[PDB]
Design a protein around this ligand. Structure first.
Ligand code: HEC
Ligand SMILES: [Cu+2]
Lengths: 249, 97
């Protein structure tokens, strides 16, 4: 969740440019963002975000059952940019934009330029439109007119790892050791895949409900080999765009 | 008496509040979403009497307001946790004395 990013990382964007959500959400999927070519100083404009996935496909949920996907994103605007205040949004636009206040949360108090949204139901939000208010360089020394980059990180679907560091049910599970599979037990969970190693020992690998077992009893497996498929339906993607902070007249 | 379970603290901290809850056989335990959602009810396990591993609702209520309420009776201490906010440290308890 975006919340998890906030606890883990003060800065959501790595030097490489990789967005932190990637640490948890392993798979890559597209992210799209559209903004105007240029905007006048203290003006409000819309940033349109889309996170595509096939609505027909269901994801493994916490209980192990299938369900819909939720989406969320981090939108990093240039310094001085912030989500627009309701008062600032012009009349035609207000209906067009996401509920300006409610959907959007700042990354941190200092971080108002970095906007977080979600999780939201994927079916509901095909497009997430952020009302954005540009800064005014005349008033603000910190910012100047020029071309700036906006970075988007957008995710759909449950992540692979927890801030605990432990893997979620929406991930591949691998054989802890090489050997033959004596047996497997099941409440959705394979409480255990029992593997008989090369020299008499027997080990048990527990997999949570959700992933689907690739292997069958009596099958030999190498260490680290995949016990299950990769159930992950979703993914996280990033895209950059540029906007010109223009001078009036 | 009728109680409620809030999911999340004003400190943008995803945790079950009150961390601890006590009630009597026949009381009810509501559940509302504070913030840092979504959330859901994913009990841990309860002693003979109730069915912790049943009430668990994976219906992640995105819409913030007030998930739902449920009445209990089986005496003992019930434990649960947040499926998502599992590592964030969002666990609580419920007693039915
Ligand atoms: C510490 C790892 C971690 C980080 C960091 C993290 N997430 Fe997640 N996220 C997860 C896991 C695991 C889940 C699944 C929780 C569950 O349902 O059990 C999740 C779920 C979500 C969901 C709900 C998806 C669904 O279909 O239910 C969204 C949306 C989301 N994360 C977005 C993001 C975004 C955007 C970022 C980065 C700004 C982010 N997450 C950072 C681990 C993380
Ligand atoms: Cu929670």
């Amino acid at each position: 969740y975006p919340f998890y990013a906030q606890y883990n990382y003060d800065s959501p964007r790595e030097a490489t440019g990789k967005i932190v959500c990637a640490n948890c959400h392993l798979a890559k999927k597209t992210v799209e963002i559209e903004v105007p070519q240029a905007v006048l100083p203290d003006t409000v404009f819309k940033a349109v975000v889309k996170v595509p996935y096939d609505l027909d496909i269901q994801q493994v949920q916490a209980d192990g059952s299938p369900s819909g996907l939720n989406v969320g994103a981090v939108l990093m605007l240039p310094e001085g940019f912030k989500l627009a205040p309701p008062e600032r949004v012009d009349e035609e636009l207000m209906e067009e934009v996401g509920d300006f206040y409610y959907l959007v949360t700042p990354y941190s108090e200092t971080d108002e330029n970095i906007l977080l949204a979600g999780p939201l139901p994927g079916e509901d939000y095909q497009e997430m439109i952020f009302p954005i208010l540009s800064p005014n360089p005349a008033t603000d020394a910190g910012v100047y007119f020029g071309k700036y980059s906006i970075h988007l990180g957008g995710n759909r679907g449950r992540g692979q790892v927890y801030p605990t560091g432990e893997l979620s049910n929406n991930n591949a599970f691998s054989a802890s050791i090489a050997g033959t599979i004596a047996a497997i037990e099941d409440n959705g969970f394979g409480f255990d895949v029992t593997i008989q190693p090369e020299d008499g020992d027997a080990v048990v690998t527990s997999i949570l409900p959700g992933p689907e077992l690739i292997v069958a009893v009596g099958d030999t497996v190498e260490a680290g080999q995949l016990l299950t498929t990769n159930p992950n339906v979703g993914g996280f993607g990033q895209m950059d765009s540029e906007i010109v902070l223009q001078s009036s007249s | 008496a009728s109680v409620q379970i809030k999911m999340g603290t004003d400190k943008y901290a995803p945790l079950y509040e009150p961390k601890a809850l006590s009630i009597s056989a026949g009381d009810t335990v509501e559940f509302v979403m504070n913030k840092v959602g979504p959330h859901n009810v994913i009990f841990d396990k309860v002693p003979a009497g109730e069915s912790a591993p049943a009430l668990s609702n994976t219906k992640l209520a995105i819409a913030p307001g007030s998930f739902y309420s449920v009445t209990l009776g089986t005496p003992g201490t019930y434990s649960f946790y947040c499926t998502p906010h599992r590592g964030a440290g969002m666990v609580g308890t419920i007693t039915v004395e």
